Design a protein around this ligand. Structure first.
Ligand SMILES: C[As](C)(=O)[O-]
Lengths: 222, 209
């Protein structure tokens, strides 16, 4: 039962370095090659290179020469990926994958080489942004009316939005965040309500940004 | 060595999808196929042109001859909706190469035009010497949209930030776009428009200072 298990998400500043781990189990680590593949967000798979698990000798794809380093710790059946002088374009999910046939199989030349088992992936985020709590703004409605709230310029993800402390759930679209060129996030939540904006039919959005201890209750009025 | 794949393939459920992978003398190489469902890691679905790893259904097949390799998927289910990638090993360079990938869409519902909501800057934001126009886009199918902003008929490219579409609980998509301006820029025009193009049709909304 082959398993490849990767280290968790990592957030790094431009210029820094990352080390990503890949622990193998359920097979002879030193009998199979380990490959590394990159996937930038919303893009295709890109082969980074392979490492010989018996010698430690790495082979890099074109352009993955210089800042990418493969290494091993065979005693703990673990393979490492290191990326130095990080740039914002290094923001990607990194997968490790076992390759078949193995080193000692004579069928390799004609039948090789495919990635039969993959790790779950490690997201490496490269950003110059610091922790920042958001500003929350009411989005006033102009037989139904839409009202909402804008959760502006925070870092990092996540934030949660609820309406009237949870008591309001029907007609609620909470939209995924946008990443701005500043490196900060923004999102909106909108509620469609029957046009009964009673002088006191209160609509409050509850915003939580846990990484900055932000909790905001905003009344949304016509 | 280059592998060329069509970016997009659409299929009616129960019908058969065909995904091609072109390469000079690809027939002389072993071709493998990976299925990647959203938010998940790739899974090997076909290796050595036509073999299936254990657990992969008989509906998945492949062929490889001359300059084209093909992944065929019979009686397509909603569960088959994913990105498919082909891969080869090059004995000359000792590289493994991936094609650019094909998004497979299983058309499980009719075309739905986006519903668009446009909000002007709030009083609170204007007080903090800032101005954001919020364009909320929902319930569109298929999951692809283009957004353009307009001021006094002119195209606005600066200060625009748009999300990728996202699958909602119903099987429709949502997206949003934000236009950041200074309070003076906001007040300097008669109206601002958010224009959302979906399958060649534009849904437009206007807001005025
Ligand atoms: C039907 As809806 C809540 O996605 O506008």
């Amino acid at each position: 039962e082959v398993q490849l298990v990767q280290s968790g998400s990592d957030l790094k500043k431009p210029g820094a370095s990352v080390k990503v781990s890949c622990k193998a189990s359920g097979y002879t680590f030193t009998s199979y090659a380990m490959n590394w593949v990159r996937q930038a967000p919303g893009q295709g798979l890109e082969w980074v290179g392979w490492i010989n698990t018996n010698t430690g000798n790495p082979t890099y794809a074109q352009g993955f020469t210089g800042r990418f380093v493969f290494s091993l710790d065979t005693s703990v059946s673990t393979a490492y990926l290191q990326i130095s002088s990080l740039k914002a374009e290094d923001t990607a999910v990194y997968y490790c994958a076992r390759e078949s046939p193995n080193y000692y199989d004579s069928s390799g030349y004609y039948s090789g080489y495919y990635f039969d088992y993959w790790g779950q992936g490690t997201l490496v985020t490269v950003s110059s942004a610091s922790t920042k709590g958001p500003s929350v703004f009411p989005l006033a409605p102009s037989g139904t009316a839409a009202l909402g709230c804008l959760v502006k310029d925070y870092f990092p993800e996540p934030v949660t939005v609820s309406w009237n402390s949870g008591a309001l759930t029907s007609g609620v679209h909470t939209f995924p965040a946008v990443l701005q060129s500043s490196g900060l996030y923004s999102l909106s939540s909108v509620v469609t309500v029957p046009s009964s904006s009673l002088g006191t039919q209160t609509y409050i959005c509850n915003v939580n940004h846990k990484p900055s201890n932000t909790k905001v209750d905003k009344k949304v009025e016509p | 060595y280059e592998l060329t794949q069509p970016p997009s393939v659409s299929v009616a459920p129960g019908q058969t999808a065909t995904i091609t992978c072109g390469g000079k003398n690809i027939g002389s190489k072993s071709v493998h196929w990976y299925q990647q469902k959203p938010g998940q890691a790739p899974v090997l679905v076909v290796y050595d042109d036509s073999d299936r790893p254990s657990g992969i259904p008989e509906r998945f097949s492949g062929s490889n001859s001359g300059n084209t390799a093909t992944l065929t998927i019979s009686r397509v289910e909603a569960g088959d909706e994913a990105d498919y990638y082909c891969q080869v090993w090059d004995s000359s360079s000792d590289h493994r190469v991936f094609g650019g990938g094909t998004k497979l869409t299983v058309l499980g519902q009719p075309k739905a035009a986006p519903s668009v909501t446009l909000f002007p800057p709030s009083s609170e934001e204007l007080q903090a010497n800032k101005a954001t126009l919020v364009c909320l886009i929902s319930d569109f199918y298929p999951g692809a949209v283009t957004v353009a902003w307009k001021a006094d008929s002119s195209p606005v490219k600066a200060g625009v930030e748009t999300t990728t579409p996202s699958k909602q609980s119903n099987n429709k998509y949502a997206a949003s776009s934000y236009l950041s301006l200074t309070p003076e820029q906001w007040k300097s025009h008669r109206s601002y428009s958010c224009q959302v193009t979906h399958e060649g049709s534009t849904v437009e909304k206007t807001v005025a200072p």
